[PDB]
Design a protein around this ligand. Sequence first.
Ligand SMILES: *[C@@H](NCCCCN)c1c(COP(=O)(O)O)cnc(C)c1O
Ligand SMILES: *[C@@H](NCCCCN)c1c(COP(=O)(O)O)cnc(C)c1O
Ligand SMILES: [Mg+2]
Lengths: 376, 363
Amino acid sequence: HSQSIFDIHPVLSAEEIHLIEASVEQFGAPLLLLDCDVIRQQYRALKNALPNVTLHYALKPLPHPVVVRTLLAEGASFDLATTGEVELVASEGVPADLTIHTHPIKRDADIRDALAYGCNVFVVDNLNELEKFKAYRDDVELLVRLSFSKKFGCSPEQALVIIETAKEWNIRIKGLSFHVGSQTTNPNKYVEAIHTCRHVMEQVVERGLPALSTLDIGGGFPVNYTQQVMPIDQFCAPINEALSLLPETVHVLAEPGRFICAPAVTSVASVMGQAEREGQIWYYLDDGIYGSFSGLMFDDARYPLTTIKQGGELIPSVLSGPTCDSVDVIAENILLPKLNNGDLVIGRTMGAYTSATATDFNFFKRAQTIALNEFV
Amino acid sequence: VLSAEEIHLIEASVEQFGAPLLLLDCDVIRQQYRALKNALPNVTLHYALKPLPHPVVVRTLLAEGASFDLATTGEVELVASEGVPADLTIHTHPIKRDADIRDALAYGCNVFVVDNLNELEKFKAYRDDVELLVRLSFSKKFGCSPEQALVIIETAKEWNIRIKGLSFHVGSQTTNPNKYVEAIHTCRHVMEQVVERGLPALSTLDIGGGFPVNYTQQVMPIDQFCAPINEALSLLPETVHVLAEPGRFICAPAVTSVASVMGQAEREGQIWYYLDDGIYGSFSGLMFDDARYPLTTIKGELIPSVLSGPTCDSVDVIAENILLPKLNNGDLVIGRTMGAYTSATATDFNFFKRAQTIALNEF
Ligand SMILES: *[C@@H](NCCCCN)c1c(COP(=O)(O)O)cnc(C)c1O
Ligand SMILES: *[C@@H](NCCCCN)c1c(COP(=O)(O)O)cnc(C)c1O
Ligand SMILES: [Mg+2]
């Protein structure tokens, strides 16, 4: 569902419109336009906002080989959750030492597959999981994931029990991790977590256990959809302050996903047909909630939407997806100029938890991703 | 409950193929088809591929004498690849690109649906080749008003486009057959108005899908469900041929899901089990189909538990509160009535493998 252009030969600009129209002319709709310049911009902005933190890109929101290559070249590390993600980074020549595996609940095979690639950092949040590493004790170092509806992470008290048990079992503990949740708009969540982890690290030392080397602050850095979020520097300011209280012997990781990929993709769908229903014009698009807009369902999402056509009468409209399902609706009420069949509907901030969560329902073709600007 | 033989079959399948699995019983496909045929005498049944577009289901139904209801080029390619003659098919997507029409025609499917004049116009170029069903609604996304149906039928005559008849779809998992009856009465009246306007008489009524199945609560037996429907159809002229587009009724009961426990943890007074299938996989119907499936274990000291899917996402939970016996890693969680709008709406999120479908009793 993807190809690259390596040789090109609120309101959209004339240049953007031209690119969009040329792309539909060349490749046909629906499309996802991936701009590698934005991947780099986002990575650089986060690096500048969170100095002295190793950024492990979480493949989950957009596990795209071009994104992986772009980030590798930029100096990024990676956060893997499955054998499939291990295989993707392996195929793109990512050195295993740049990777961590963070799925807290793993089958024996999942551990073996990652180890075979060379990824040797894993996460545990319970004793049942810890036991799985006895057979691998020479080979691994573990992050213990804390939580403070949450599905993963143990309590601070449980974390100490896990760490003490790992010592008994001769299993190395690399450090602690947490994930405050995706699209977190309040940085105080990070601050409170960091303080708690710091206190846990102190308790480990006071108990005479090996001192922890690493804090992994997870993902969740927010981006703008239809509402303004805190600028990344301002967002990370209190985070940086909390981190500064850690011992100098602790180094810090994060697992950003959405922040890096979300702004980098623009969706393009076309109108297949249309009908007036109870005073609204319904447009039936070639992409929807079983496709690139699946984030409306799984990610509680809302994306800015626009049209190339602008000006004249704005009409109460409905944007429907292509499937036969009445649930497949992208915008229940939206003002739009009158569109003809074949006219384009554009979605912004379409990079994260979109195509990643697409289906093949009805066998409608998935949007094709077009990768731009990888080199230079 | 699971029978001793069901348990043996499930365990044997996991022994051979691993987990997660979807066990597809072709005998149940046959049974459901035969039961609906008996319940709705003289109605031609077009299986909707959408809920479960599996090659073995298509072959099984073809052999049974079934017809087919297609929505997309992909579905056209599926029945074609399984050798289904085009005359057993109808294409029912109301909103089509020119290519969608051409692809269906290439295969030989010549029956299409329209619910508006914009769509009707797409068929001028194919007037020699097509006959159309006009879809009424009485709900939200498709179907014109009875008054609009008349405008469409009249301008089709003007444009020299053939109208096969009328269609409707009252909605999936319709538990009250009285919605069909009201639909049928309204269509009967539209048919009368066509004749009274001096237009060509309509040959066909398509009553759509929506026949319900038992999930966690029982629904009315199919014979009883359809009794009032047959009564309503009996008031039609004897010359009208009746079609239906059952999906869920045929496929839903034919599949049993099998997942295994990858790991587990106590989280505030509940044991969480993390399965190898979930809301991004076979249980995607929890999201898209507003579904709830009966869930059981192979195994009496029922303890408060949560069933989570495999993905990292906190949304990926199958059951928030369920009483289960204590399970060990590797133990199985079994879902019933897992045939329809399940695997069909699976994703590849996190690159977790989709459950493998195992066809049983194919021959
Ligand atoms: C992502 N977790 C699931 C997000 C599901 C969205 N519908 C996750 C990330 C990346 O989160 P992000 O908000 O920066 O994209 C990082 N680390 C862990 C452990 C995650 O689960
Ligand atoms: C199915 N329509 C969408 C169902 C989405 C469920 N989440 C459909 C059918 C088959 O319906 P069923 O209830 O018998 O499976 C038949 N005909 C049409 C036109 C449909 O859209
Ligand atoms: Mg290392």
